[PDB]
Amino acid sequence: MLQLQRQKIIQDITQQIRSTLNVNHILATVTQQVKELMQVERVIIFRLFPNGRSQIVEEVVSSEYAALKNYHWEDEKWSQEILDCYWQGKPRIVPDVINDIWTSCLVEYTTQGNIQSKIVAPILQELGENETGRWVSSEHKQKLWGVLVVHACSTKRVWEEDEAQLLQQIANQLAIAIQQLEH
Amino acid sequence: MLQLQRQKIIQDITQQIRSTLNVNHILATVTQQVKELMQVERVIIFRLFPNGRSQIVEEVVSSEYAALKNYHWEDEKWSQEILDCYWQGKPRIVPDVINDIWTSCLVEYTTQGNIQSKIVAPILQELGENETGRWVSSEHKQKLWGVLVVHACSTKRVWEEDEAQLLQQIANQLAIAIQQLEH
Numbered sequence A, B: 001m002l003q004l005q006r007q008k009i010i011q012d013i014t015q016q017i018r019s020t021l022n023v024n025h026i027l028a029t030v031t032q033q034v035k036e037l038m039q040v041e042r043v044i045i046f047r048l049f050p051n052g053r054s055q056i057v058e059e060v061v062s063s064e065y066a067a068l069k070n071y072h073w074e075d076e077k078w079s080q081e082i083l084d085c086y087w088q089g090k091p092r093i094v095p096d097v098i099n100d101i102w103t104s105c106l107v108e109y110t111t112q113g114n115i116q117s118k119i120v121a122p123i124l125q126e127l128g129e130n131e132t133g134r135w136v137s138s139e140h141k142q143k144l145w146g147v148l149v150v151h152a153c154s155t156k157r158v159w160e161e162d163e164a165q166l167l168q169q170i171a172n173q174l175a176i177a178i179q180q181l182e183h
């Protein structure tokens, strides 16, 4: 019968639930919006795992340039001066990545991605209680879940304060949303 | 300048985040869909708190009938036979609420809501570890968060198995979504 039409919305409703409630769908939607809004050739999310691994988990490329999605690496150590900056929730403006000494090794990765300049915006979990790893601070009582990056590949783009100021405000809203959807 | 247009999407993006991530917005949207789909005059969510309190937290009424939103009560005890049924994740079809012995006291509430017949669908949290209250089971290792109800007020409506079968499938999808958004 038309008991058939009962389930053409249950598959809708279940769709909206699993949609809104899995993290990746709201990563892939935010990133797509940051990309279109800042007219940036690439937006990525760099996920930092405590064991030392780290992977590009979402990316939204201008089709001109490579897909660095899923790109990865183990035992990721960052420079202490850099991590102090990102722990305080401050972004980073890298107006020339190729002569940036902190990204002096991601030159394979730099040259493929075609990155000239970029803004790096930390994503911070207020994680209290007991957890410790490679990306966790005792001074600032927060863990660095990962990093929202924006890539300017076609030109050595100059960035404004309120462009980075803005980015960080968007990551800081992912910090909250991620603390929620981890099971 | 047009730095103005930077923030006419940050207020958008923040909107989608706080939207999708607060529980009530996805309660109020599901209930509105259950109402329109089953052509029921009222849909409510009965929230059961462990201390004994209990309140109608969402409701979507056919404007003809009262707003039982926010309706409430303390030290809510249910009949043991009834709770056993709901713990196993089984709905309940009350084809005549007025001579239902289990709802023999909600007759103030019955007479205002104009309820003739109704389907009650439990919402179950797989909550392990250590928590105990008035709505928690050791036999079934699950807590009764609350209850999705549908009200047939204009007529003593007859319900189908796949109407209740269906309801329960929708609550069971809220069970998962709620376990996620509790901070």
Ligand SMILES: *[C@@H](C)[C@H]1/C(=C/c2[nH]c(/C=C3N=C(/C=C4\NC(=O)C(CC)=C4C)C(C)=C\3CCC(=O)O)c(CCC(=O)O)c2C)NC(=O)[C@@H]1C
Residues within 6 Å of the ligand: A044, A046, A054, A056, A071, A072, A073, A075, A076, A077, A078, A079, A082, A092, A094, A101, A102, A103, A104, A105, A106, A107, A108, A109, A118, A120, A149
């Ligand atoms: C070299 C000085 C050290 C380092 C720098 C560093 N990396 C990032 C962020 C990223 N790290 C990677 C991945 C890699 N780490 C590697 O060591 C290698 C191999 C060469 C790879 C491929 C990636 C993809 C990123 C994100 C880069 C991006 O901009 O899209 C940072 C943080 C961001 C920044 O530029 O400030 C830094 C400082 N990481 C190390 O492990 C080296 C000791």
Ligand SMILES: *[C@@H](C)[C@H]1/C(=C/c2[nH]c(/C=C3N=C(/C=C4\NC(=O)C(CC)=C4C)C(C)=C\3CCC(=O)O)c(CCC(=O)O)c2C)NC(=O)[C@@H]1C
Residues within 6 Å of the ligand: B044, B046, B054, B056, B071, B072, B073, B075, B076, B077, B078, B079, B082, B092, B094, B101, B102, B103, B104, B105, B106, B107, B108, B109, B118, B120, B149
């Ligand atoms: C009376 C036998 C007992 C009882 C029955 C019972 N109530 C519900 C669900 C609801 N309980 C309320 C609220 C009230 N509980 C009260 O004791 C009073 C005062 C009279 C109120 C107002 C509400 C709003 C509900 C939801 C009702 C709905 O159908 O919309 C149930 C579960 C649902 C069912 O009908 O099977 C039951 C069994 N609860 C008690 O506390 C009494 C001992």
